[PDB]
Amino acid sequence: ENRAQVAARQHNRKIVEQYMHTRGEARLKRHLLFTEDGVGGLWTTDSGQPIAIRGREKLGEHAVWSLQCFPDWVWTDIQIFETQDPNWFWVECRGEGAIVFPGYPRGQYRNHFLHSFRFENGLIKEQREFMNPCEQFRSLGIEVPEVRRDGLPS
């Protein structure tokens, strides 16, 4: 049991490292790090519902879009956390790049991120990214509402 868990954790860590360092044209093949039915996407959005991309085929299609709308994206300040589950990792990092969304002015987007990676048989079964959407709003020129703080201790 321990031997199998140690082997899984060490292999899965290398896949997380590879995913987090993938940039440029290599993004077009990042979906090969997933199971055929693997899921990826953004869990923190304006609607409160995740934008989940389901299946290795749709993940590869999404990468094409990502190359147009986040053309130079880089993950920085990467810290990878193994867990007691050899098949579950967390990553704390930052990300940065141009944001080129349809019908918005071109912007520069910087944010802090957390990623969750769950594995099955050596590949990613579920990737999820979590951020503060207010920073993406700012990068797009969208007004961010402000909670009134007058009544709060400061």
Ligand X SMILES: O=C(c1ccc(O)cc1)c1c(-c2ccc(O)cc2)sc2cc(O)ccc12
Contact residues for a copy of itself (CB under 8 A)?
Answer: 43-48, 61-62, 65, 81-85, 88, 90, 92, 101-104, 112, 114, 116, 130, 132-138, 140, 142-148, 150-153
C-alpha to C-alpha distance for 72 and 74, rounded to whole angstroms: 7
Residue (65 or 104) nearer to ligand X, CB? 65
Q: Interface with ligand X includes 100 (CB under 6 A)?
A: no
98-111 in b/e form (b: 16+ CB < 10 A) is ebeeeeeeeeebeb
Q: In degrees to the nearest 10, what's the CA dihedral of 106, 110, 114, 118?
A: 40
Least distance in angstroms from the C-beta of 7 to a copy of itself: 16
Of residues 55-74, those binding ligand X (CB under 6 A) = 65
Identify the H or E element spanning 19.
helix 2-21
Among 79, 84, 147, 151, binds ligand X (CB under 6 A): 147
Q: Which 126-145 positions form the footprint of ligand X (CB under 6 A)? A: 133, 136
Q: What DSSP designation does 152 have?
A: S
CA-based nearest residue to 34, from 17, 15, 21, 48: 15
Rounded to the nearest whole angstrom, what is the least distance from the CB of residue 1 to ligand X in the complex?
A: 35
Name the binder of 144 from a copy of itself, ligand X, none, CB < 5-8 A by kind: a copy of itself
- Compute the distance between CA of residue 80 and CA of residue 18 in angstroms, rounded to an integer: 11
Q: Which residues bind ligand X (CB under 6 A)?
A: 41-42, 45-46, 51, 53, 65, 133, 136, 147, 149, 152-153
